[PDB]
């Protein structure tokens, strides 16, 4: 086994003990440790663990400042070389070239792997966690300096590469290669944005364009918006803007569905509206857009809509079944949703809410540190649990949809604003009052209302066409 530098000149050579590292019960899994031990294992000479690097870089800010992390890995990089051994000494004294066997081994099996793994931390940091550097220009200067002054031919290729990667990141296309299906049109024709509405756009294309929009919103959310539960805190608009944009879209679509339903006073027309919404749900299911699925289900379970017995009675049985199957995804703490998500073939759009609750509860329900033998150790298993969730999120962010954007329909849904200038409570009360108007509480009898739509109500259906 290789001898190490003295722990006095090089801090990362301290022997493992339960006072500085605790393992979980073919590489070890770390339950807790000092920062020094975490960094040693982050850059361990015996094995690589790129997943550990992702976990660490995603979650470290809860126990180490970015400036301090950089100081520590630079310290890790600077490894002293051992002096010549007795055999080398004797060779040198006789004017011969020493074999330097121990030195060569230490360079090859300790220094070069540890240094390369420090550089891999720097590479991952810059490529996937660049916000540290966006938010602290001095941190970036320090990284540029460190990388730019690493000498020696062994590291040279990666040093030159990481220098270029940093420069690219500072100033900063899909193959399928089957073509996307043809865009489908119903009553509203291309370019006639003024007529776009729930019933005039093709239900297939409504679902497709919402899926592209909701996929883009899903794919834009970074772990920085999630770790530390920052989307729930005072500065959430600063720290979690992509997440909040995503959630607000979902909320607005749900409210739009409710509004379309309760503002359609005529029973027959309202049945057509609900039936069209369930057709859109069916296409969401086909596209694996689970956010879209739950947008619809949330609308149908809302107070204004849920109580509309006369409308429900006229919905075709096959659509009742579709809605029921969709709702059952959410039953028993999303048991069937979770199984379905894990079984489909991506691309998909997950429901984000579950991830948020699990991240928040993991962070709230586990201690930052473990106290052992008089020492405070960083609770790393807590951070690993958070990173397993952010890792799952990222895994579903990779696969793009093979669907063509329609710029006008996209804009129409980007600009949807069912609440107008009203506050939430005011709008929400309005919707419920509309519900009460169109279908009064028993024993009040059911009124009749005039029709509002001048165009045909018959759906073109949700099976795609192909000339």
């Amino acid at each position: 086994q290789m001898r190490l530098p003295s722990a006095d000149v090089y801090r990362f050579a301290e022997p493992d003990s339960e006072e500085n590292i605790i393992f979980e019960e073919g590489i070890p899994i770390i339950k807790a440790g000092t920062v020094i031990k975490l960094i040693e294992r982050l850059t361990y000479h015996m094995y690589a663990d790129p997943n550990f690097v992702r976990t660490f870089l995603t979650t470290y800010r809860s126990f180490c400042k970015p400036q301090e992390l950089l100081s520590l890995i630079i310290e890790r990089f600077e490894i002293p070389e051992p002096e010549p051994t007795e055999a080398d000494r004797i060779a040198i004294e006789n004017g011969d070239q020493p074999l330097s066997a121990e030195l060569k081994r230490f360079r090859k099996e300790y220094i070069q792997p540890v240094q390369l793994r420090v550089l891999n931390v720097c590479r991952h940091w810059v490529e996937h966690h660049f916000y540290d550097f966006e938010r602290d220009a001095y941190l970036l200067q320090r990284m540029e300096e460190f990388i730019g002054t690493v000498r020696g031919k062994a590291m040279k290729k990666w040093v030159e590469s990481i220098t270029k990667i940093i420069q690219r990141k500072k100033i900063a296309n899909i193959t399928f290669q089957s073509s996307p299906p043809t865009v489908e049109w119903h009553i509203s024709r291309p370019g006639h944005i003024e007529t776009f509405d729930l019933l005039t756009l093709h239900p297939i294309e409504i679902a497709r364009q919402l899926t592209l929009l909701e996929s883009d919103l899903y794919r834009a959310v970074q772990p920085s918006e999630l770790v530390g539960s920052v989307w729930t805190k005072e500065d959430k608009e600063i720290n979690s803007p992509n997440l909040l944009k995503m959630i607000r879209h979902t909320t607005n679509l749900t409210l739009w569905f409710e509004k379309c339903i309760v503002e359609t006073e005529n029973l027959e027309e309202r049945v057509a509206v609900v039936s069209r919404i369930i057709e859109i749900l069916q296409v969401f299911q086909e596209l694996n857009n689970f956010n879209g699925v739950l947008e619809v289900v949330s609308a149908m379970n809302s107070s204004p809509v849920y109580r509309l017995d006369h409308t429900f009675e006229q919905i075709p049985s096959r659509q009742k079944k579709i809605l029921e199957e969709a709702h059952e995804l959410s039953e028993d703490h999303y048991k069937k949703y979770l199984a379905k998500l894990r079984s489909i073939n991506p691309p998909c759009v997950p429901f984000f809410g579950i991830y948020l609750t699990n991240i928040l509860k993991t962070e709230e329900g586990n201690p930052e540190v473990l106290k052992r033998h008089g020492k405070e150790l960083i609770n790393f298993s807590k951070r690993r649990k958070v990173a397993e969730i952010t890792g799952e999120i990222q895994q579903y962010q990779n696969q793009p949809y093979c669907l063509r954007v329609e710029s006008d329909i996209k804009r129409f849904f980007e600009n949807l604003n069912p609440m107008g200038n009203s506050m939430e409570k005011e709008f929400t009360d309005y919707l419920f009052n509309k519900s009460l108007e169109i279908e009064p509480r028993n024993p009040k009898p059911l009124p009749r209302f005039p029709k509002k739509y001048s165009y045909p109500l018959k759906s073109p259906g949700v099976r795609p066409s192909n000339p």
């Binding site: 989307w231 805190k233 979902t250 909320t251 409710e258 949330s298 048991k335 609750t357 509860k361 409570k425």
Partner: protein
Amino acid sequence: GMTEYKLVVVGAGGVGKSALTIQLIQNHFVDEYDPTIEDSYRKQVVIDGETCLLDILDTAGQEEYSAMRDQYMRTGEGFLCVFAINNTKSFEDIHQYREQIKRVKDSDDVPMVLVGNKCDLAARTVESRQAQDLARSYGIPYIETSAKTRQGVEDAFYTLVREIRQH
């Protein structure tokens, strides 16, 4: 089998709401938690001599999905309405949560308890007398809990189960 109660936790986000259910379901003597596994929100308890099963829905973290509240609330037979005693806005929010629960359940008399949660050592801004008066005006129990010491946590949930049993 035994009776199972579907309990739902509601209240403002960002002020330690999640500690209530976590402290209950937890351990209850080793501070750790994996919300990912079922039985992280199901718990068998004995209340007034009768064994029952608690199923608790706490969607803490999903507060911005405001149009999903009806759907989540619909699943429950009893409700804990939680505010933080150092956050007046969360206390002022309670009225709308209660109104929303009544609407979803279509009833003026839904089993619920008001819970004032102490989530840190920051200064209290809602006096217990304020919260008592509000609870009395609603005809419901008031329980104060600590997010750190587990104090009041069993009382909050057991009291709600009693409100359900006596409905």
